[PDB]
Amino acid sequence: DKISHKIDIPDSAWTIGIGEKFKNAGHPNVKYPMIDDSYVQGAPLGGFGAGTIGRTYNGGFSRWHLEIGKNKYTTVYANQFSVFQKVEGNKDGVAQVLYAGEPENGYLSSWKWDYPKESGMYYALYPNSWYTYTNKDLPVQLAVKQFSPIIPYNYKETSYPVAVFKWTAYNPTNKNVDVSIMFTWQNMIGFFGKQVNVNSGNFNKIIKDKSKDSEIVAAVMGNISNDNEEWNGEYSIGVKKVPGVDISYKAKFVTTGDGSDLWHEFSKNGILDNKDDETPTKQDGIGSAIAVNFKLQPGQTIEVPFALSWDLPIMKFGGGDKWYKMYTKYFGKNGKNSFAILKEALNNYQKWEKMIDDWQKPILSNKSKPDWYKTALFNELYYLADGGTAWENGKVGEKRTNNMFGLLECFDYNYYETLDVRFYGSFPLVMLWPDIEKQVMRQFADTINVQDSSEFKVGSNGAMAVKKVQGMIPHDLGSSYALPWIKINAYDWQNPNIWKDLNSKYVLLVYRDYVLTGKTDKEFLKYTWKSVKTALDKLKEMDKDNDGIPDNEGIPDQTYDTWSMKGTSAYCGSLWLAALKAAQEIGKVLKDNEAYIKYNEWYKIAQQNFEKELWNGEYYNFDTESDHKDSIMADQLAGQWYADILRLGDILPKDHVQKALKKIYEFNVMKFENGKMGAVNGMRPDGIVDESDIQAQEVWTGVTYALASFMKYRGMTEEAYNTAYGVYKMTYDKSGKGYWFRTPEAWTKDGNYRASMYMRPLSIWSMEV
């Protein structure tokens, strides 16, 4: 490996061998079918709301999130990089697809598949990833850096449906070597969204953009139809000429044949026929190819950029609504702009790389932080792009000031912006894209007084309940299978209109977003104030026994939606205390004296009773009335965690908080599989896991990172990082369960999981407040 030093991969990149088998992989631990796409994953490509494409560590374009809100794992075999090399003085060269696998059927049988093991590495530090190719039969070593311009405080390039592939090639040998790199791509119009005739009308064209000191050559893969539908648009691949390289192309090869129409050309001398052909297809799948060819002398290096774009301007949800995607603001809505997007990337990728370096540098250059922590911090962000992210620029056939946004809870539980989860998972948005975060919160503010008296069947017990009650914050802003932003509360396992955490979490999120954006946005506080007061006043009505605290009803009436709470719980009770303190402060800022006094009075009463009811001398009891009310809950002081972040001071005595956190570390972490797997949710005082519900026996990745944050800002530094390390280990390490780029909600002690690709572990960014 002499290519590593010609490129700059950070030491904190996650790494794996190309073609590496992983033996320890976890699987779902639930009864009903659950997504399990295997451990063959990678960092995704694509901006926010663009649809993303997961290219795996084996090189395949395999995890397709282009249909917004859906996860489709299938390798499109035509989509590849391939290499040809010939040593000067030899009769024949060698050609190889850079994919550690082969097709399942006979399509593309002529291509050279099965890139060998032990011949290259994959590296990832989101939004960047890299492949190195160090193969004994390829004298010239290659590497590629691939990325999309995901940039904090940037709402433009961050939205783009584009990826850059910056290749580096180096000849360490003493002979001249002829080298070609070829990008192939299937015309994927009709891959989703088209009910019949899926390839019909697909056609490919070549664009040659020649200016001074510039040549880009690109294939545009589209359809003859000008229909404005979800399935229609264009894909483009292309390359920018650099000194010392020639470009060749093939506009049309058949993907549903043996591939030899293309491969016979490439495998001979690495040079394609330059045959244009715009003839549309009927049944056959078609693709395009763009190649570069160059000669490397001994010791010579060359860099060449390729790119990929996709202009699919319309997203459609299962309820019928069609929206334009955010990037259309910048490139247009007609679905004929893939070349413009590609050209922007090819002409500006060097600036984008520097912008990414500029935002990663503060963390990467802090040598007090271990590299494993940096691996997790950056790579967990894959979810902001990969979480079915929807970001609208208008409803089809209708202009407003804002662009509504939503991130899925996950794909198995297909709900946008689940609020009890975003309480944990929204940290990267407030920290790094605060204009999105505030937009999401204003969306919630607007729903507070919505009433929908239609009824749904509650899944957990079969009872009928009202869909949306006035004054109760919704669980979610809909499902991609139905109508995101329009039909809220798609969740039906429990009735969220009686949850005891949603209204308080809402208030806490509002105040968080003011505090973490500099305490300057009074306008955001003004927009949300009525909803905040309404939320607290409605939750106060759920105090059945006049202790000043909402009562859990002996059912799962909060985020732990199979774990029953009864009476005053540490979790919902501490959230309530913190939300009251936050509202007091907002009242002061907005000069609403009567709100300040009222919430101050509720706070003093609730605080005294919480302490009396739950403090046991060592920690806060789980609750006041449950069968295992003395269980040690990992999240028992969630309200105090948030109060620390919001700078609201002590809601509970410092001594008791410290005692409680030390107990959690000593028990829920250290007596759970040696502290190597995170904090288990519930532990009995005798040091064995609480078995009253599956959720008590689970480690929640997002809860655990949040607890690590809580510990860190309370000065328990070793405990904080040791607690977080188990999550990192299980997710990324060789000794883990193979969850890289699909961090789940939960695992049990056997390491098996529930709900891969989950929003909650984005809470790791609360460790960087």
Ligand X SMILES: OC[C@H]1NC[C@H](O)[C@@H](O)[C@@H]1O
- List interacting residues with ligand X (CB under 6 A): 409, 413, 415, 418, 420-421, 491, 559, 561, 745
- CB 95 to ligand X: min, Å: 48
Tell me: is residue 549 an annotated ligand-binding position.
yes
Interaction partner, residue 547 (Ca ion, ligand X, none; CB < 5-8 Å by kind): Ca ion
Helix axes 570-590, 593-614, angle to 10 degrees: 160
559 binds, options ligand X, Ca ion, none, Cβ within 5 to 8 A by partner type: ligand X
Question: How many angstroms from the chain centroid is the CA of residue 97?
Answer: 29
491 binds, among ligand X, Ca ion, none (CB under 5 to 8 A by kind): ligand X
Q: Closest approach of Cβ 644 to Ca ion, in Å?
A: 25
Is 547 marked as binding a ligand? yes
Handedness of CA 589, 429, 706, 538 (dihedral sign): positive
* Residue carrying structure tokens 């009910």: 195
Sequence-separated (6 or more) residues with CB below 8 Å from residue 555: 460, 494, 564
**Helices 638-646 & 570-590 angle (0-180, nearest 10):** 30
| Rounded-to-integer distance, Cα 412 and Cα 496, Å | 18
Tell whether residue 473 is among the known ligand binding residues.
Answer: no
d(CA 62, CA 54): 6
Q: How far is the CB of 198 from ligand X (least distance, A)?
A: 33
Closest CB 693 distance from ligand X, rounded Å: 11
754 neighbors 36 (Cβ within 8 angstroms): no
Minimum distance of ligand X from residue 390's CB (angstroms): 17
Among 50, 345, 549, 661, binds Ca ion (CB under 5 A): 549
Q: How far is the CB of 68 from ligand X (least distance, A)?
A: 19
Q: Is the dihedral of CA 337, 433, 759, 495 positive or negative?
A: negative
Nearer to ligand X, 415 or 728 (CB): 415
By CB under 5 A, name the one of 234, 265, 409, 547 that touches Ca ion: 547
Is residue 564 within 8 Å of 626, Cβ to Cβ?
yes
> Which residue number, 138 or 421, has a Cβ lying nearer to ligand X?
421
- Residues binding Ca ion: what is the number (CB under 5 A)? 5
Distance set, CA 371 to CA 199, 355, 366, 720 (Å)? 47, 21, 10, 15
**Contacted entry of Ca ion, ligand X, none for residue 413, CB cut-off 5 to 8 Å set by kind:** ligand X
* Cα–Cα distance for residue pair 344/148, rounded to 1 Å: 12
Q: Is 553 in the site for Ca ion (CB under 5 A)?
A: no
Choose the contact partner of 437 out of Ca ion, ligand X, none; CB within 5 to 8 A by kind.
none
What is the nearest approach in angstroms of ligand X to the Cβ of residue 428?
Answer: 19
Alpha-carbon distance of 144 to 547, in angstroms, equals: 62
181: β partners: 83, 292
For ligand X, the closer of residues 57 and 571 by Cβ is: 571
Task: Identify residue 381 by its one-letter amino acid code.
Answer: L
Distance CA 262, CA 289 (A): 8
Distance of CA 554 to the CA centre of its chain: 34
> Can you tell me which of 215, 452, 543, 618 binds Ca ion, judged by CB under 5 A?
543
- Is the Cβ of residue 417 or residue 513 nearer to ligand X in the bound state? 417
Residue 616 main-chain phi, psi, to 5 deg:
-110, 5
Candidate ranges 104-112, 287-295, 537-545, 658-666; the one touching Ca ion (CB under 5 A): 537-545
Tell me: does residue 551 bind Ca ion (CB under 5 A).
yes
Closest-CB residue for ligand X? 559
Backbone angles phi, psi at 143, to 5 degrees: -145, 155
Using CA of residue 95, residue 99, residue 100, residue 106, what is the dihedral sign? negative
One residue of 545, 601, 691, 750 binding Ca ion per CB under 5 A: 545
Residue 266 or 610: which CB sits closer to Ca ion? 610
Q: Which is nearer to ligand X, 425 or 726 (CB)?
A: 425
User: Annotated binding residue at 551?
Assistant: yes
Residue number of the CB closest to Ca ion reads 543
DSSP helix, strand, coil percent of the chain (3-state; round to 5): 30, 25, 45
Given Ca ion, ligand X, none, residue 543, with its beta carbon under 5 to 8 Å by kind, binds Ca ion
CB of 8 to Ca ion, least distance (A): 58
476 touching Ca ion, by CB under 5 A: no
Q: Cβ closer to ligand X: 26 or 60?
A: 26
Minimum Å distance from CB 745 to ligand X?
Answer: 5
Closer CB to Ca ion, residue 278 or residue 545? 545
- Footprint of Ca ion on 336-355 (CB under 5 A): none
529 binds, among Ca ion, ligand X, none (CB under 5 to 8 A by kind): none
In 615-674, which residue ranges form alpha helices assigned H by DSSP? 638-646, 654-664
545 labelled binding-site residue: yes
Q: Which residue numbers in the chain precede an interruption (C–N > 2.5 Å)?
A: 398
Query: What are the residues binding Ca ion (CB under 5 A)?
Result: 543, 545, 547, 549, 551
Binding residues for Ca(2+), by number, are: 543, 545, 547, 549, 551
